[PDB]
């Protein structure tokens, strides 16, 4: 198995696992909520044109990402 084919299986498991773990965080189909779920701000219509199912607004999600940057 030449020691660089098991490397190939490990690397393809790495890429596929990471890319599936990202694509599960795209929340493709959802409901049109029109209001953010931590602020009640009107989420603009171009943003729902981008992502169907954004329960968070742009900058409250930005705050969520900045809080999740470290952990906890």
């Amino acid at each position: 198995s030449d020691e660089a084919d098991e490397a190939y299986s490990v690397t393809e498991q790495l890429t596929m696992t990471g890319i599936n773990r990202i694509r599960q965080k795209i929340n493709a189909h959802g409901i049109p909520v029109y209001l953010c779920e931590a602020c009640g701000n009107p989420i603009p219509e171009a943003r729902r044109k981008i992502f169907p199912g954004v329960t968070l607004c742009v900058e409250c999600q930005a705050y969520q990402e900045r809080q999740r940057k470290h952990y906890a």
């Binding site: 198995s1 030449d2 020691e3 660089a4 098991e6 490397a7 190939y8 299986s9 490990v10 690397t11 393809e12 498991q13 790495l14 890429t15 696992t17 990471g18 890319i19 599936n20 773990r21 990202i22 694509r23 965080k25 795209i26 603009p44 171009a46 943003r47 981008i50 992502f51 742009v58 900058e59 999600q61 930005a62 990402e65």
Partner: protein, 1343 residues
């Protein structure tokens, strides 16, 4: 010859008994003549002569003087090998504690004297004086007296006050301690001290005390006074080159002890002051500690090398120790190695041995056969002849080599197909030639592996080679019975190339009389290898009394499939070669040939497959080129499209519509979808070529492109690597787990530029590092599973149980991931299996369910088969032959004496190394099929509007067709909106349930008026005023911010009459009030007309890898254990938030002591008036396995583990028969705890071996008394291996010092009886062909 090995403590008289003298000087040798001294460390008067039958003096040097003792030097004329076995002693001038019996952590001396370790280590190093039988002079025996306290307490007391310090004190304590007198007084206070810690300590000490009386050891033997020295041939002083020498470190440690003992001897001869003699005795005690175990006291002293010295404990313990590194892992004569090459002219049962290696390995065989035929007279003449390698010794050697197997073995021997025996065929060169089919059984390729070859000398080992280890006797994988000799890459390209059609090839539409005409047409060049013709085919079918009924027809085949039909044996039909014949098709063809015809025609068929595959792959000319990677023409457009998309989302992140995290997620998703698009375009561009024609029209066909012909056949690799050749490479990973968002839009038929090539190396370097780190830990799990399952051998033919697991396939939601014919095959029917008419027995009982029986019960559509399992076998220290099943490496039923514990350890470890060495986690019911709904736990109510909502707890969904078997299996939520009624067969395409996790109602049973009594807002509810519609909401609270005036009290959901009379529960004389746990969305009012099943109170809202099979066998307790319903009966809550809630399940006919400390953070599945039986769900998540064994049966942790371990194996795609996890589980939970000790001879709080419990309870019920009941315990596979019976076995995988001290003080014995025991000891194993020898020796003991 000895039959048992007994361990004890060495008597001082016995230490002097082993001795052949006393070592007095720390001199080793003469320094001038290199001679042994007169009484030194390497003495000759004590240990013996340096030369065989020759004195040290030189006088009685003759072989006529054998046995006499010289008068000048005192040596005995013997062999010099007698100083390998002769000990001497060192009489220590002061007693000294054995550090094994003191600085062990149980500390047997400390636990024995009823004093803690700080006491004895203070007294031993001369700090405290200790009272030994102190009369009546105002003292306590076994008391610390510090020096000033001893001095001022010696005042006013003319009694001699009996206060010693050091090992004299501990020795006079250990001698004056009566063990049995203390046992009687300890049991006397045990008559009157039923506490927890008190009784625990009393019985904990009394266990070691009762062992110490029944053993026969003396407690004063733990304090050493005379010291045994090793023989000089076990600490040698070898003379090396140039005058240089080399000793062992035990020489330095014994020299330290002899120095300190001689100096202490002088310091007690000299009447020295007491402080320097205290320091000398403490130094000598420290030297004894450094000699016996250099480092248990601290620190391990280093010599002129800066590593610590190896001591006697370090010479038995450790990785390099004799127990590990020399009792099993040991070099072997009649062995050799060289590299492997292919040489495919071989058959399946021969390896190609070189001729110099066969000249060397078979030397005594050559000598015996060469002088028996008398071509040499002397064995010196034979030696000079075969050193000359004359023209006759090759004839004698090829005579010798004829039927004499050689064990070819390659180094990472993960399973038993790493060692197979081959007949040797003499080749020239220096490389072992090795049959190409078994390269997938050794995992041995030809980039330079070397196979070690051994020779079986004896006729018993020659016959073991021929009868078990021959490569044709092992052609089924012992993990799962599929053949392991699957043709791997060139054979499948040949068999795929010859048997895959072309639309217009030469010689189309001819009619041939058979395969002979087809090979004659192809070999003359009139027909192509794949041209659709009409061949006349004689295919034989044994669909009668083993008949081979022949039938000749006119098939529509190609030429090459007809040519390949000649190598097929009789019993196979023609439709098995009338196809493409990829890799899985040859696997199924060899499997069909085995299942139909047996073992030998499968071997001849696999050889003919290999020959035909290599030959027609050679005649293929199947090259690979640069034009075999056709780059898709739409690849530029998909790359430009994705670059336009990520430009657009780069804009909308510059516009602040999305953040950088969502922008990274969006470009990762966009580039991955574009990579899938490019791969789809090239895979559709590649697999269809255009060919023309019989009539001259365009006609698509499957392309003969060699890269597609390699990917599609399963020759080598799959369409992912073809994506990285022609299509784009994709998104590349990082060692952080992250994904590099700039993908690789190029490939390997074009180039990669410098940036993409630097990007690729993160993932490739991480992959190669994890590969080369996994191979340094290849069989750690195989080792950890042979420790737990060493001594499990099939001993009984049929124990005769009636129990067993009842096997049903893995229907998880929709499809079935693994059917019944995978599992129930080969297992033995524990009962009689009836038809779905429940009228006739299909398979009687005690039957090996082969593929005919499993074909029969799958034609009869049987669904619930109760197999005979290993975890319910009624035999002891073994399994029966039927509770296991069949062999799986042979297809027969298993034999008496197969080591199925080691076999299953290997069949979990060797497929288990194909798993990832690092772990990885990954509305309305979709009703598809039609049929009848079956429900267990079914208590449903009608609604007014025709819908349904189920008010019973675990009513999960089972769909049945008209076949008996389950179709759709799902968990119905508690009160989801059903369009399903009851029992009526519905059609597919209509929702059965509209679930919502925001919806968990407390839907009523009877219709009526929900008035509220004991209902006060403010201390029970929140003030919920929904402005949303203007409804009256009463959303109940937890124990957080309400009062304690209404905390323990619950609000009533009481549904009453139109007048206001309290309606009864149907069946129960209790009222109708459904009191609520936390967070229920209530819409109600007092006195509103609602129907039965009204939505009153809605409640709101797969890991893989080898570490998972690590953690599944170690049986970890997860940090979120799904708590259960410990006892059957209806439920009530308990105390509100003293940290945790309580919950009193109250049995309606039994006692209710269980108010379980339930945390409030893990929310209830249940309501607090909802009857759940034992073994029922409360929390949600990973269920702890010990709770399955305590509550449910032993077949419910057996079904739990072997479905959870196989959920790791089937996730990656590795198949394994589930016998192999069941013999590990059967050896896991062989501990029972006693609860009712009864007339059985065990304590209450006692954990013992279960199959000793089941035989005492067999015999103490066989009298007129009654026996114990037991609660089964389950342990981890590093902890189940701890509680072995042997101490020779246990000291090879556990820590030897803690094992050997625990073994010595018990006076323990080892009747050997085990695989690892007798392997160390040098006997036959009790497993294999040595089972009958352990019958032959267990016959002579009952003589």
């Amino acid at each position: 010859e000895f039959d048992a090995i007994k361990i004890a403590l060495a008597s001082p008289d016995m230490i002097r008994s082993w001795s052949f003298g006393e070592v007095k000087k720390p001199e080793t040798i003469n320094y001038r003549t290199f001679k042994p001294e007169r009484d030194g460390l390497f003495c000759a008067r004590i240990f013996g002569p340096v030369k065989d039958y020759e004195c040290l003096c030189g006088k009685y040097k003759r072989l006529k003087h054998r046995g006499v003792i010289c008068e000048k030097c005192g040596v005995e004329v013997t062999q010099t090998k007698v100083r390998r076995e002769r000990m001497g002693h060192i009489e220590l001038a002061s007693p000294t504690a054995h550090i094994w019996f003191l600085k062990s952590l149980p500390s047997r001396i400390g636990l024995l004297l009823d004093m803690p370790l700080r006491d004895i280590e203070r007294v031993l190093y001369f700090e405290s004086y200790v009272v030994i039988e102190g009369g009546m002079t105002n003292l306590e025996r076994q008391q610390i007296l510090t020096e000033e306290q001893y001095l001022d307490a010696l005042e006013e007391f003319g009694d001699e006050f009996d206060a010693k310090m050091g090992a004299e004190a501990i020795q006079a304590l250990l001698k004056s301690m009566d063990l049995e007198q203390e046992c009687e007084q300890l049991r006397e206070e045990l008559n009157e001290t039923n506490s927890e810690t008190k009784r625990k300590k009393l019985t904990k000490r009394i266990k070691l005390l009762e062992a110490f009386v029944q053993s026969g050891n003396k407690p004063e033997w733990m304090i050493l006074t005379v010291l045994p020295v090793l023989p000089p041939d076990l600490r040698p002083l070898v003379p090396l080159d140039g005058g240089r020498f080399a000793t062992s470190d035990l020489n330095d440690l014994y020299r330290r002890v002899i120095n300190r003992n001689n100096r202490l001897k002088r310091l007690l001869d000299l009447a020295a002051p007491d402080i320097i003699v205290r320091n000398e005795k403490r130094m000598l005690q420290e030297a004894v500690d450094a000699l016996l175990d250099n480092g248990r006291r601290g620190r391990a002293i280093t010599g002129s090398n800066k590593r610590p010295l190896k001591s006697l404990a370090d010479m038995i313990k450790g990785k390099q120790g004799r127990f590990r590194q020399n009792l099993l892992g040991k070099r072997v004569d009649y062995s050799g190695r060289s590299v492997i090459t292919v040489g495919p002219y071989l058959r399946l049962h021969q390896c190609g041995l070189p001729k110099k290696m066969a000249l060397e390995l078979f030397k005594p065989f050559i000598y015996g056969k060469l002088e028996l035929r008398g071509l040499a007279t002397t064995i010196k003449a034979a030696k000079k002849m075969v050193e000359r390698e004359e023209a006759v010794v090759w004839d004698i050697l090829d005579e010798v080599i004829r039927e004499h197997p050689v064990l070819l073995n390659r180094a990472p021997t993960l399973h038993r197909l790493g060692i197979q025996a081959f007949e040797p065929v003499l080749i020239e060169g220096k490389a072992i030639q090795l049959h190409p089919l078994v390269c997938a059984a050794y995992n041995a390729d030809f980039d330079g592996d070397q196979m070690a070859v051994h020779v079986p000398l004896t006729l018993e080992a020659q016959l073991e080679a021929r009868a078990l280890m021959m490569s044709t006797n092992n052609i089924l994988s012992p993990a799962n019975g599929e053949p392991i000799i699957v043709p791997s890459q060139d054979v499948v390209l040949g068999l795929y190339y010859m048997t895959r059609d072309c639309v217009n090839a030469k010689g189309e539409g001819m009619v041939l009389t058979g395969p002979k005409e087809a090979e004659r047409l192809y070999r003359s060049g009139l027909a192509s290898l794949h041209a659709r013709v009409k061949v006349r085919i004689t295919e034989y079918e044994k669909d009668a009394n083993g008949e081979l009924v022949a039938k000749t027809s006119l098939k529509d085949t190609t030429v090459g499939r007809a040519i390949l039909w000649m190598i097929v044996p009789k019993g196979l039909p023609y439709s098995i070669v009338n196809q493409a014949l990829g890799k899985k098709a040859i696997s199924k063809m060899l499997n069909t040939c085995y299942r139909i015809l047996g073992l030998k025609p499968t071997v001849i068929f696999a050889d003919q497959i290999m020959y035909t595959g290599f030959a027609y792959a050679a005649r293929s000319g199947a090259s690979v080129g640069i034009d075999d990677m056709v780059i898709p023409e739409k690849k530029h457009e998909i790359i430009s499209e994705a670059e336009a998309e990520v430009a657009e989302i780069q804009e909308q992140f510059q516009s602040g519509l999305v953040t950088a995290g969502e922008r990274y997620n969006k470009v990762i998703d966009i580039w991955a979808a574009a990579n899938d698009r490019v791969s789809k375009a090239m895979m559709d561009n590649l697999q269809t070529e255009t060919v023309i024609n019989r009539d001259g029209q365009e006609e698509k066909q499957v392309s003969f492109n060699s890269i597609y012909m390699m990917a599609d056949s399963g020759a080598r690799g799959s369409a992912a690597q073809i994506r990285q050749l022609a299509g784009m490479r994709g998104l590349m990973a990082k060692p952080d787990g992250s994904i590099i968002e700039t993908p690789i839009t190029a490939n390997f038929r074009e180039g990669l530029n410098v940036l993409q090539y630097f990007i690729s190396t993160h993932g490739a370097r991480k992959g190669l590092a994890d590969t080369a780190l996994k191979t340094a830990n290849s069989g750690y799990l195989t080792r950890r599973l042979v420790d737990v399952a060493q001594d499990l051998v099939v001993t009984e033919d049929d124990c005769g149980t009636h129990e067993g697991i009842m096997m049903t396939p893995v229907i998880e939601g929709g499809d079935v991931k693994e059917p019944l014919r995978d599992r129930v095959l080969g297992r033995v029917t524990a009962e009689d299996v009836l038809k779905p008419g429940t009228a006739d027995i299909l398979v009687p009982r005690n039957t090996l369910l082969h593929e005919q029986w499993c074909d029969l019960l799958e034609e009869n559509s049987v669904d619930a088969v109760k197999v005979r399992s290993v975890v319910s076998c009624d035999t002891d220290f073994g399994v029966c032959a039927h509770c296991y099943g069949r062999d799986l490496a042979r297809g027969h039923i298993i034999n008496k004496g197969e080591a199925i514990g080691v076999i299953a350890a290997q069949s979990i470890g060797e497929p288990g190394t194909q798993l990832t060495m690092r772990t990885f986690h990954i509305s309305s019911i979709q009703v598809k099929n039609k049929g009848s709904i079956k429900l267990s736990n079914v208590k449903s109510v009608v609604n007014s509007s025709g819908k349904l909502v189920i008010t019973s707890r675990n009513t999960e969904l089972k769909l049945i067709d008209e076949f008996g078997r389950t179709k759709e299996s799902y968990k119905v939520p508690y009160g989801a909106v059903l369009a399903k009624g009851d029992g009526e067969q519905v059609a597919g395409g209509e929702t059965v349930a509209n679930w919502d996790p925001h919806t968990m109602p407390v839907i009523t049973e009877v219709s009526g008026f929900v008035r509220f009594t004991d209902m006060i807002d403010g201390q029970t509810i929140t003030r919920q005023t929904d402005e949303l519609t203007g409804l009256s909401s009463l959303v109940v609270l937890d124990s957080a911010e309400r009062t304690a005036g209404g905390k323990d009290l619950r609000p009533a959901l009481k549904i009453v009459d139109a007048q206001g009379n309290d309606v009864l529960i149907p069946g129960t004389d209790m009222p109708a009030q459904y009191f609520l746990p936390g967070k229920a969305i209530v819409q109600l009012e007092d006195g509103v007309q609602i129907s039965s099943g009204d939505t009153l109170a809605r409640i709101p809202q797969i890991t893989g890898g080898l570490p998972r099979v690590a953690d599944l066998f170690e049986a970890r307790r997860p940090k979120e254990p799904a708590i259960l319903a410990e006892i059957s009966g209806i439920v009530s809550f308990g105390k509100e938030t003293k940290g945790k809630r309580r919950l009193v399940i109250t049995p309606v006919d039994g006692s209710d002591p269980y108010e379980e400390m339930i945390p409030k953070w893990r929310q209830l599945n249940v309501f607090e008036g909802e009857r759940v039986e034992r073994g029922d769900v409360i929390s949600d998540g990973p269920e702890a396995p010990h709770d399955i064994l305590r509550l449910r049966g032993v077949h419910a942790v057996t079904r739990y583990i072997v479905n959870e371990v196989q959920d790791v194996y089937r996730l990656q795609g590795v198949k394994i028969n589930d016998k192999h996890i069941e013999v590990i589980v059967r050896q896991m939970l062989r501990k029972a705890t006693i609860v009712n000790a009864g007339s059985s001879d065990f304590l209450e709080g006692e954990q013992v071996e279960y199959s000793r419990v089941k035989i005492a309870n067999r015999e103490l019920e066989a009298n007129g008394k009654v026996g114990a009941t037991y609660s089964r315990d389950l342990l981890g596979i590093t902890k189940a291996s701890l509680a072995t019976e042997s101490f020779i076995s246990a000291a090879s995988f556990q820590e030897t010092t803690r094992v050997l001290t625990e073994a010595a003080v018990a006076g323990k014995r080892d009747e050997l009886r085990g695989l690892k025991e007798n392997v160390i000891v040098g006997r036959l194993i009790p497993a294999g062909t040595g089972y009958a020898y352990h019958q032959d020796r267990m016959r002579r003991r009952a003589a």
